[PDB]
């Protein structure tokens, strides 16, 4: 489970996700990847499940990069607790993403293997996804 | 820490309080290893009103008397230019020694300050 | 240990009210202050 | 349970009071600030709490010098 080793502040205001991702929207470090098409909070459990899927596929070959990191703490109130009286109990960390942000990247496997593995990873994520490849890629060899 | 920057800091400190106008011009002094130069400056215009130095002036062998002669000369030049009130600028030097003699001689002359 | 201090020895009388730390300054504080009655500077001492 | 927060001090109404180009009488307060966000210049005095005020009557001028340092001055007559 990805989460910061230390943090300055325990609580964070629930911000707002606004437009498209202007950084991290281009395939760097790899040849194939998947971009989000929605705005959402991605949890560490979802990230780990998707990474496990994409690594169980492709066998032992290739390399996989995860490009987002959960560093936003969230809280939950709890059953029987009324509104008010401060923040609730901490319940982990999330990464907020907007459409265009690349979540997963792979390199070192053929086109079909990459496409299938990234499909498998995308099926465990809470956002609809687009599969992308680097534009200077050669389809053969 | 070069002596140039050491004097530049003191020059900035002195200019933090002392500035010259057409009335009460700034009397700035340069020492050097020999001779001594005195200038009367109107700062709002960036224009020198009077000057004096010991480059063509030589009467004794000791810098204190030479500085006194320069002070008398600059008092004369200022009174000829129509200057009676000034403000002295240390120009980064301690007010003691040759500059003290120059200022004292300028007091013995005109330049009521 | 910080307390009110009264300076006296005027001429009515001239008083000044200041503060001091008595543990730090056990001895009596005495300073020259302006005297309105005599219109000059006189030595005032803590009472 | 309970919250350990809930405190806040009163706002001090800081900021620029007379902007560049306006006319200021003598003694008018120009800026309320903490420290020297703006430094005094010609015909401008600075108080104990770094309040900038006019020493004369004229037009307020804001200027910028080296290191983007901001100066407030008064142009008179």
């Amino acid at each position: 489970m990805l989460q910061p080793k230390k943090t300055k502040f325990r609580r964070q205001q629930k911000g707002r996700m606004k437009g498209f991702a202007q950084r991290g929207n281009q395939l760097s470090f790899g040849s194939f990847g998947i971009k989000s098409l929605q705005s959402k909070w991605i949890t560490g459990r979802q990230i780990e499940a998707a990474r496990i899927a994409v690594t169980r596929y492709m066998q032992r070959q290739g390399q996989v990069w995860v490009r987002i990191f959960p560093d936003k703490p969230i809280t939950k109130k709890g059953e029987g607790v009324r509104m008010g009286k401060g923040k609730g109990a901490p319940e982990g960390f999330v990464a907020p993403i907007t459409p265009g942000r690349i979540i997963f990247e792979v390199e070192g496997v053929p086109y079909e293997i990459a496409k299938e593995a990234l499909r498998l990873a995308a099926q465990k994520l809470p956002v609809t996804t687009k599969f992308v490849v680097r534009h200077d890629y050669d389809i053969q060899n | 820490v070069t002596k140039e920057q050491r004097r530049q800091k003191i020059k900035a400190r002195v200019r933090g309080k002392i500035s010259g106008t057409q009335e009460k011009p700034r009397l700035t002094v340069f020492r050097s290893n020999k001779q001594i130069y005195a200038q009367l400056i109107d700062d709002i215009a960036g224009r020198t009103l009077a000057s004096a130095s010991s480059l063509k002036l030589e009467m004794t062998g000791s810098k204190k008397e030479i500085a006194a002669k320069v002070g008398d000369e600059i008092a004369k030049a200022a009174t000829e230019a129509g200057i009676s009130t000034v403000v002295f600028d240390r120009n980064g030097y301690l007010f003691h020694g040759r500059i003290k003699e120059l200022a004292d001689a300028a007091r013995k002359g005109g330049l009521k300050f | 240990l910080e307390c009110t201090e009264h300076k006296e020895s005027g001429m009515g009388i001239s008083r000044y009210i200041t503060t001091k730390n008595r543990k730090n300054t056990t001895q009596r504080l005495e300073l020259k202050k302006y005297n309105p009655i005599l219109r000059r500077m006189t030595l005032h001492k803590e009472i | 349970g309970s919250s350990k927060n809930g405190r806040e001090s009163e706002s001090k109404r800081l900021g620029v009071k007379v902007y560049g180009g306006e006319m200021a009488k003598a003694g008018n307060i120009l800026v309320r600030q903490r420290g020297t966000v703006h430094h005094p210049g010609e015909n401008v005095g600075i108080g104990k709490d770094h309040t900038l005020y006019a020493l004369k009557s004229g037009v307020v001028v804001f200027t910028r010098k080296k290191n983007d340092r901001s100066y407030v001055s008064i142009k008179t007559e």
Binding site: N25, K35, P99, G100, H135, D138 | - | - | -
Partner: protein, 128 residues
């Protein structure tokens, strides 16, 4: 190692003009470098095939309808964050002197070769 391209002149600028250009399936492009002011023009998404391509095809010969003809190389490309479509192209005009640094594909220790058009100083490409 020589692409051919033609450009419709562009004189309207702004978000409105760029949207109007892109609605009819074309790309705003600028060309600068060396002496002389830059040239603004419009190319077509079909016309650009040096972008979705394996090699670094230097020497794009551009004929701009309102201007002369130049030999340039790809300098900057802007993509849409979501659709990955091409939204703007900037070309750097290469001259006889003033060598231009670019990226040249690597085969296994090989390259594609840059001696003409561009002078020298090729950095690398896909140095994995």
């Amino acid at each position: 190692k020589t692409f051919q391209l033609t450009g419709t002149p562009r004189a309207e600028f702004g978000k409105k003009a760029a949207k109007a250009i892109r609605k009819e399936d074309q790309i705003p492009a600028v060309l600068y470098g060396g002496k002389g002011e830059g040239v603004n023009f419009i190319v077509s998404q079909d016309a650009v095939r040096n972008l979705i391509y394996s090699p670094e095809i230097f020497l794009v010969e551009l004929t701009v309808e309102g201007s002369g003809s130049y030999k340039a190389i790809l300098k900057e490309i802007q993509f849409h964050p979501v659709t990955d479509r091409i939204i703007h192209i900037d070309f750097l005009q290469v001259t006889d002197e003033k060598p231009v640094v670019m990226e040249v594909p690597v085969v296994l220790g090989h390259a594609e070769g840059v001696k003409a058009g561009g002078k020298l100083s090729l950095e690398m490409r896909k140095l994995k």
